[PDB]
């Protein structure tokens, strides 16, 4: 080997680069973290996986997409776009999850994720994430979206900042799920929650603070009462 | 509405954006948070609520600009700012406070921060916010200033990172008060606390991290024995 | 002193804030935190202290090169770089450890800190660090490297986000150590912890987030059982 | 005082003078006509607070100015007393260190004088007179029914022509709650 080695540096992940480094020059980012308490979707998730005897499987991201794409509904500008001349806001949820593929990353879209119950959520994001392993997608299929989802809890990653796609505006980053110790009324004083910190990354041109902390404040809200997510 | 809509930026819009890129681009921004009690200031705020009986009503946002002004009293890097050529130092303390009104963000300016109580401090506060949230503010009124403080624990934001203005240096940001569980001595082993976390965001051309960790060193413990802001 | 004094900007400041400027401008950062706990590192490092009867005296800072050394030797694309053309890959790990003299900042540079002991890595650091406060240093001897460290825990930081040099791919950044309250399953149901959060900023054109979280995950699994670093 | 002394580890010393000229600086602001004086053709109201301090200089009376008293903390003006009375002691004083000023205290009780009433320098129009601080026997509503408290008197000499003894009365109501709830400085 040497001292070092050099590797050449391939096409895609070239463009890819390049259109990361465009974003972070053009987009001005900004960071808003807040905490989530996890017990009840636990036990929701729970009590569908036991009523479907094995028709499908519904994972915590399925809950978060579905709760993310609500939020966008509530709040527009966490949806919306900047196209410098014109701002425009996407009255559908196209939801851009990040697979982290051993080859690099990928990015399947859940379309119409605003209208999708959980199952159909979580069957499409198998299906995707079966496809992007195997390395066939169309561009149609990882190209676009309205908002981005990133997760990272099963690194054990506890708090993280993504980077805003060129067109987007938002992107939510999702880190690991961990046993705190919040303070109770109860006899000894204290009671052990599942606690989960989400990190929002918005473009401050398109979306104020007050905005994002309302986009954040209605997604704790879904995500901590799901029988919410009815309405 | 079909599928999307496309809303014409404002001038206005325009502008901020242009000056928050600008700002982006040539400013390296760089972000170190610390926690503080808030224990005391619950308690002095509240004594001094009893005494004002009527007369006036102080916020903790009140404190944290005293705090703010005499910090940057004490390390005088974070009051500075860059003009390329030449590096200003300002004396005075100029608190730029931002304020979310329904129709964007203003920054009221509260002059001579470092010299005047918390009474007048919260007084003058609470006049520039109802001319902001009224429509009618002098250029002078909220253009300029020497140092930026931006609060959204109205909000339940746990933690976020704000960004400069161009020609300042530095921004603080404040997020929610929550009672934590702290060890303790006592029988039981721990203690109920209300902590609240804060993120400055510092210029590194102008502030290093010694320099901005001493700032928040200074800051949390003005804030943490309030009776040291008579020093 | 009037209304605000301007002060010259030496060159070598100048030179300084244009590369990190020039840094800021074209590495697009992300940012990745975790946890760690230091009660098996605090114990270690008593009993290697007690050992070494004043021949050497062992710190944290050296338990975290070496465990970041070891990382660097497990995922290689953390000590990587980007060159535009290529990528160049370090089969050696440098580690440029930032001090804060009072006359800015330093970066000694300890070299082959992947096949080196804690007690070496001490004596270097220690050495190196005395000739930064004297302020003769060769250019070598603080120009280059292929990972940076910067440790602010002795100033109350909790967290901080630190800035890559324009070579490097990664920085680490270090906070106080402070004692938790965990959950456990003893008798009381908790128990006092020594945690320390640790931000590592990637560049997003060479690390991805899975690779930088493999990374955290195994300087965490190194500084918390420290008997691993003999394999 | 004793928790600001704690807090500042040798870095400075804090006296309980420098409380009674805080004090007396923020309620010359609250009521403006003790700051003020007399000049026969108008009435001159000033609205900064310079406070003349005596000191007794073994060589007679020396009068150190703290200029600004309103708008600096307990540190910087026990600082600035230091190093005046340092100064006074050893005998050299620029003029206009020791001549003029808006507000005027002297301090006696070093020396177990109990009250005692001063006299106005010409141009201002009030001093304060500041005697010992003895421990009282005031009524309490505890289980002994009374309580020791630590009290001090002090004598406001007022310009007639210029302060009414209601304004002086406030001036003084002012300066005692002031000393009475220390937070209230904050204000």
């Known amino acids: 080997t040497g001292v070092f080695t050099d590797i050449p540096i ?7 680069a390049q259109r ?4 972070k020059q053009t987009i001005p980012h900004y960071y808003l973290s807040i905490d989530v308490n996890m017990g009840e979707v636990l036990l929701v998730r729970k009590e569908l996986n036991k009523i479907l005897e094995g028709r499908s499987k519904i994972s915590v991201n399925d809950f978060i997409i579905k709760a993310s794409a609500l939020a966008c509904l509530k709040v527009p500008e966490a949806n ?9 806001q996407n009255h559908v949820v196209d939801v851009s999850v ?32 079966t496809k992007a392993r195997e390395g066939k997608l169309q561009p149609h299929e990882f190209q676009g979206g309205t908002f981005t989802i990133s997760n990272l809890g099963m690194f054990g990653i506890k708090n993280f900042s993504a980077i805003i796609n060129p067109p ?26 599942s606690m989960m910190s989400v990190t929002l ?6 979306v104020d603070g007050a905005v994002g902390a309302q986009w954040l404040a209605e997604f704790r809200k879904y995500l901590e009462k799901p029988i919410t997510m009815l309405l």
């Open 10 to 16: 391939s096409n895609i992940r070239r463009v890819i």
């Open 20 to 23: 990361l480094m465009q974003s």
């Open 80 to 88: 919306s776009s900047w196209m410098d001349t014109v701002i425009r």
């Open 98 to 129: 990040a697979v982290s593929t051993p080859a690099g990353l990928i990015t399947p879209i859940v379309f119409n994720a605003h209208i999708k119950g959980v199952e159909t959520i979580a069957n499409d994001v198998v299906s995707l994430a």
């Open 168 to 193: 987007q505006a938002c992107i939510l980053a999702i880190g690991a799920s961990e046993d705190k110790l919040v303070p109770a009324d109860n006899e000894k004083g204290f009671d052990v929650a």
């Open 201 to 206: 990354s918005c473009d401050h041109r398109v």
